[PDB]
RNA sequence: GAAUCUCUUUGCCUUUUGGCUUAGAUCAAGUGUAGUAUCUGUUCUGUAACAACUG
RNA sequence: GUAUGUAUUUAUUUUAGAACUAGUUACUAACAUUUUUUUUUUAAAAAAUAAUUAUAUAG
């Protein structure tokens, strides 16, 4: 129900620019196919280009310094119109560096396609939006919040239902404890021969190795404790 | 208007958005116990998740279950201080101090070189007030040539209790466990504040002819 | 001053707790020769202040750690994440980075 | 103090890390003169076969 | 995610030592060296004619990959 | 440390050993000094055992012994990583120590062909018109070859709807998309990324490079008016091969025939000898300098599709996570690569070979020669090289010699040479197929 | 000097990224009908006192 | 479409709101079967060509 866009190359708009960034800062920079898939009517090659070319922050778009502009001259007179290897040479993006070379040796229609489109400016928006960058801004949210497997999600919703599970086997014996027929509750099965009980006993107990001390009269203190503690959450309830 | 920051702050806001008779109670604790000793049989480390299970036997008022959880998680990492300070004071909040006396006790013969130890089984016996217990326990403490803090820390001792007679034999064999002159000068400076004219002058001359 | 080790930490609670322990005070051994074991005759008294003393003092504590998780949350000016732990690590990452260089 | 790891490969809790966070010798000159003093010298050369051509 | 651990720890050998076992017969216990041992002109028309301790960094690798590369 | 930290720690084993496979030199800003050092110790082991492994998998590739497809899969990968690495650190050496080209060699290497192309006379490939009489015909065959990748298959990637599409809309408005490859020849010199992935032969493994699709049909129409102005200006001369006359059996059994036809030289009478060297012009395309190209590629075209030709080469070089800019290496993959490939290798012809006889074996330009023929018999004998032609790499020469002639030339060798323990016969390498 | 409450820097970080390999790999152009999700618009806004009984 | 997992108790253990309205996006679903070659003009003109399909797909 899209008609399909064969040829994604378009102008970098400022929608396109922040989802890619806000992409950048979650996917990473090597994953490019994961974030040209986020905004559409983009490639993950011109995803790559504009990252590389314009939207990083570690690139050198200032004015010239006259030592920078000297250097220019020079290194373009060494190197005939080799515009790569002059841009690393001065950690710069090769694009500034053509225009400024133009605009020293100086002292579009429309229907056109523009190859030189991730490194140029972008174009801010109308006040309100279109209709699909609203969609793109809605599944863009949508994608960048899920951080979750399928086995994780699914232990998200075992933990709910269990839980109000168990709500509901507390609730029809409470029922039942009121018109006088009390059942017990059923305990979980084991899925193996030795599987343990956490009641019964205390399953691995350590015995504190007695010192030269004596705790009869503390061991007798406890136990008439914990002895009342039971016997009120029996009558009261806690 | 649009950037990326208030993405953000969009997708974080939407991100961000009875036990009444005995039996209720052991199905409570049968269901947490499965968790924890779960998560315990999985991962033998992770002290944390030790403190926190005994923690529960605490708020059962269940002791004995509480003193083998704390003794299982000794049994794994026997060089965790906090697993000690937590089961020695999960022994005197709930009174049961010769339990406490006897876990110290076991925790500095265990770990003789850790400071922290032997202060907290110091500070127990000064709460209770048995001031013999606290002077025996600083002699132990001193025999095994500590170190300056627990040396400090027993002539400050022996001066609130204003033993002045004590202090000079702590420091007589406080000036030969460390040979400075900082030790010298500190049992100098107590024979000025508390002493005699002829006991700092003797002092100054055991000092001077020994150097 | 910087990071302080074990060994001072622990002597500078000790004083702290006998200066509360002081200022807390102004507002025998048996031996049984049959087992080996120790009675030492403590009065009821000074055990229930040694249990109240630990048990407030933990509730201290435990309060004003629980004031600053909400003062920590509410101040949004480090950076953009996604959840309520992405907050912790990228203040983690603001104290670290600050601090080195 | 180690500082805290952080990958532009794997992110494995999903969290987003601040964007600033993950991201000549003489032959050549020398080279470059010595074709332009060819160029100038087969110019020169050619004009003046061109003028001797010319007689 | 969450299944993929970095195995801090390793499975002691004591954790198996008080286990019953089986007698099961195995292919390589059965006996084998039973024994042991004991010690007791034309020439002229030119216009030219007259271990560094790093694998990746040395000759055998570049010669290996100058060969099959093409 | 207590333990929590430990598995912290380990996260920068990982992050380094990643960053040595893609050659990203993994700098931790606030990172203490000897922890660096036992990291960057380990994944020196680590890489140590990964390339030894790659190269012995890569031997039981060659020899036939049983290997699976994921261990063939696994080794193309290892092997692709080691070759983009070696070819990093030979970019980084050539910008770091210079050229080895040193002008003299650059002065009289430029003197011989500015020489050479006087004598031919050569009119030099114009910019292409704006009404070019020949130029849609030039469009269809260019499109043709960009057209035949596709006759096949019906399940489509992304990729390749994008390049269909970019040719039937070239197929749809000619004049417009002709207009636009008049104004990229012109006025663009900054170009996209090019990606070189691997495709294995089991002996050997051998590099694809793939372009961006709407620079590729500009490429593919620089290369039909390249070839066909060349052609019209007869610029390669006879010996310079593969020619659109012959297949390759036919110019075997040409270059045989020719052997057998040329003056007595079976003839051994008098104790003469004929000689045949067949060679390898070793690395030629890794070896061009682009400044020495431009200027010896403005000497035969207009300067704007020199500078078009010279700055599509110095582009971004990207396998999977790994990019470097190719700043002396001549790419293989660009559509008219074939064309800057036999000029160099005519200049390399005419150091081997000379003026004199390089006039000999073209002829005038007035009429041309044939591939081996003489306008007459003395021509032929007037020098001891008979024969001469190049494929791609390779060349091949024929020599004839008299009796004095061979003993005074091994004279100068075993003069400059001398061999009195007789091991002149144990480096000679000769064909044991026969 | 000393305690109680409360705020700053300073320590502590306390829900504070838990393996491997060929970045593990590939690719996001189908119609109807149906389910789920969300998103735009319009209108309207008995009580008190007095007389009597204390059962 | 498999794998794999989960659910299925009776034979009784003593005492700020209110109302109205319709389509646009994504994702999922073993759930479902209107020709070929052109030409020409600005709808009409020409030319042309030949007893009838699968129940089969899985990590």
């Avoid at chain 1, 053509?98 to 972008?122: C, F």
């Avoid at chain 1, 801004?137 to 497997?149: D, I, K, P, S, Y």
């Avoid at chain 2, 939407?14 to 604790?29: F, T």
């Avoid at chain 3, 609670?13 to 049984?32: C, F, G, H, I, M």
């Amino acid at each position: 129900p899209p008609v399909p866009i064969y040829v994604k190359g378009g102008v970098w708009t400022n929608v396109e620019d922040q989802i890619l960034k806000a992409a950048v800062q979650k996917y990473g920079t090597h994953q490019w196919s994961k974030v040209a898939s986020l905004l559409q009517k983009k490639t993950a090659r011109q995803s790559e280009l504009r990252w590389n070319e314009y939207l990083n922050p570690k690139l050198n778009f200032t004015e010239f310094s006259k030592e920078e502009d000297a250097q220019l001259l020079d290194l373009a007179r060494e190197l005939p119109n080799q515009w790569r290897t002059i841009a690393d040479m001065m950690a710069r993006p090769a694009q500034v560096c053509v225009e400024r070379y133009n605009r020293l040796l100086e002292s579009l229609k429309a229907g056109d396609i523009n190859p030189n489109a991730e490194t140029q400016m972008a174009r801010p928006d109308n006040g309100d939006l279109e209709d699909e960058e609203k969609e793109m801004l809605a599944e863009a949210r949508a994608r960048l919040l899920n951080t979750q497997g399928k086995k994780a999600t699914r232990k998200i919703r075992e933990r709910m239902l269990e839980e109000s599970k168990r709500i509901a086997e507390l609730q029809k014996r409470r029922e039942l404890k009121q018109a006088g027929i009390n059942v017990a509750i059923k305990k979980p099965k084991k899925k193996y021969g030795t599987d343990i009980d956490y009641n019964e006993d205390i399953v691995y107990e350590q015995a504190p190795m007695p010192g030269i001390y004596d705790t009869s009269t503390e061991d007798r203190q406890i136990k008439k404790k914990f002895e009342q503690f039971e016997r009120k959450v029996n009558r009261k309830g806690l | 208007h649009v950037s990326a920051e208030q993405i953000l702050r969009d997708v974080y806001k939407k991100g961000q958005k009875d036990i009444l008779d005995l039996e209720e109670l052991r199905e409570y604790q049968r269901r947490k116990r499965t968790e924890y000793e779960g998560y315990l049989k999985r991962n033998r480390l992770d002290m944390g998740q030790w403190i926190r299970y005994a923690q529960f036997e605490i708020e059962q008022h269940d002791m004995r279950r509480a003193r083998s959880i704390f003794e299982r998680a000794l049994l794994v990492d026997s060089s965790f201080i906090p697993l000690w300070i937590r089961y020695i004071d999960a022994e005197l909040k709930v009174k049961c101090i010769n339990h406490a006396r006897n876990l110290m006790n076991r925790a500095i013969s265990t770990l003789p070189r850790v400071d922290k130890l032997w202060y907290k089984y110091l500070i127990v016996e000064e709460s209770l007030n048995n001031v013999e217990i606290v002077r025996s326990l600083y002699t132990k403490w001193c025999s095994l040539e500590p170190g300056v803090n627990a040396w400090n820390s027993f002539v400050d001792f022996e001066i609130r209790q204003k033993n002045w007679n004590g202090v000079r034999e702590i420091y007589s064999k406080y000036v030969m466990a460390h040979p400075q002159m900082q030790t010298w000068l500190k049992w100098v400076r107590f024979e000025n504040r508390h002493g005699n004219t002829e006991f700092t002058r003797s002092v100054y001359s055991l000092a001077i002819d020994t150097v | 001053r910087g990071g302080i080790s074990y060994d001072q930490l622990a002597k500078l609670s000790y004083e702290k707790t006998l200066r509360n322990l002081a200022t807390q005070t102004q507002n025998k051994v048996q031996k049984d020769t049959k087992t080996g074991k120790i009675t030492i005759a403590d009065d009821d008294k000074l055990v229930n202040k040694l249990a109240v003393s630990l048990q407030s003092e933990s509730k201290k504590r435990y309060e004003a750690r629980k004031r600053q998780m909400q003062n920590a949350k509410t101040l949004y000016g480090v950076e953009s994440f996604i959840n309520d732990k992405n907050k912790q690590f990228n203040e983690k990452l603001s104290r670290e980075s600050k601090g080195s260089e | 103090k180690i500082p805290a790891a952080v990958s532009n490969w794997k992110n494995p809790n999903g969290y987003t890390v601040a964007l600033e966070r993950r991201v000549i010798n003489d032959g050549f000159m020398k080279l470059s003169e010595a074709l332009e003093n060819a160029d100038k010298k087969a110019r020169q050369e050619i004009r003046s076969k061109m003028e001797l051509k010319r007689l | 995610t969450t299944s993929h651990r970095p195995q801090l720890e390793a499975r002691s050998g004591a954790k198996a030592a008080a286990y019953t076992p089986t007698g099961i017969e195995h292919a390589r216990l059965l006996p084998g060296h039973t024994t042991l041992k004991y010690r007791k002109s034309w020439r002229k028309g030119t216009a030219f004619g007259r271990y560094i301790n790093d694998m990746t960094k040395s000759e055998y690798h570049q010669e290996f990959l100058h060969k099959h590369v093409r | 440390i207590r333990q929590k930290k430990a598995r912290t720690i380990l996260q920068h084993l990982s992050e380094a050993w990643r960053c040595w496979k893609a050659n990203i030199p993994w700098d931790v800003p606030g990172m203490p000094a000897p922890i660096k050092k036992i990291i960057e110790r380990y994944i020196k082991s680590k890489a140590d055992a990964w390339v030894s492994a790659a190269h012995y998998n890569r031997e039981r590739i060659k020899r036939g012994a049983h290997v699976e497809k994921t261990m063939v899969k696994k080794n193309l990968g290892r092997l692709t990583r080691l070759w983009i690495k070696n070819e990093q650190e030979r970019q980084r050496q050539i910008q770091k120590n210079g050229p080895e080209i040193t002008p003299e060699e650059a002065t009289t290497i430029f003197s011989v062909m500015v020489e050479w192309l006087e004598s031919r006379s050569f009119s030099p490939i114009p910019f292409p018109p704006l009404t070019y009489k020949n130029d849609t015909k030039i469009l269809v065959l260019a499109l043709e070859d960009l057209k035949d990748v596709y006759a096949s298959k019906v399940r489509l990637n992304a990729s390749e709807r994008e390049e269909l599409a970019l040719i039937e809309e070239a197929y749809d408005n000619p004049h417009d998309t002709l207009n636009r490859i008049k104004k990229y020849l012109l006025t663009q010199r900054v170009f996209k990324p090019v990606d070189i992935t691997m495709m294995e032969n089991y002996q050997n493994i051998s590099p694809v490079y793939s372009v961006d699709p709407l620079e590729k049909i500009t490429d593919a129409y620089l290369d039909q008016y390249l070839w066909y102005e060349a052609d019209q200006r007869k610029l390669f001369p006879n010996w310079i091969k593969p020619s659109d006359s012959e297949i390759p059996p036919l110019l075997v059994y040409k270059w045989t025939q020719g052997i057998n036809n040329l003056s007595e030289i079976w003839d051994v009478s008098r104790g003469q000898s004929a000689v045949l060297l067949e060679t390898t012009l070793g690395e030629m395309a890794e070896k061009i300098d682009f400044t020495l190209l431009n200027r010896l590629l403005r000497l035969i075209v207009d300067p704007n599709i020199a500078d078009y030709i010279t700055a599509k080469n110095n582009v971004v070089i990207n396998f999977k996570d790994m990019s470097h800019v190719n700043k002396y290496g001549l790419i293989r993959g660009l559509k008219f690569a074939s064309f800057i490939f036999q000029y160099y290798g005519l200049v390399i012809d005419l150091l081997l070979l000379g003026q004199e006889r390089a006039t000999d074996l073209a002829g005038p330009a007035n009429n041309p020669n044939e591939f081996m023929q003489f306008k007459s018999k003395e021509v032929e004998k007037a020098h001891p090289i008979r024969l001469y032609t190049r494929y791609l790499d390779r060349i091949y020469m024929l020599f004839h010699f008299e009796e004095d002639e061979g003993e005074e030339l091994t004279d100068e060798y075993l003069a400059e040479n001398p061999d009195p323990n007789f091991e002149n016969s144990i480096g000679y390498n000769n064909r044991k197929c026969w």
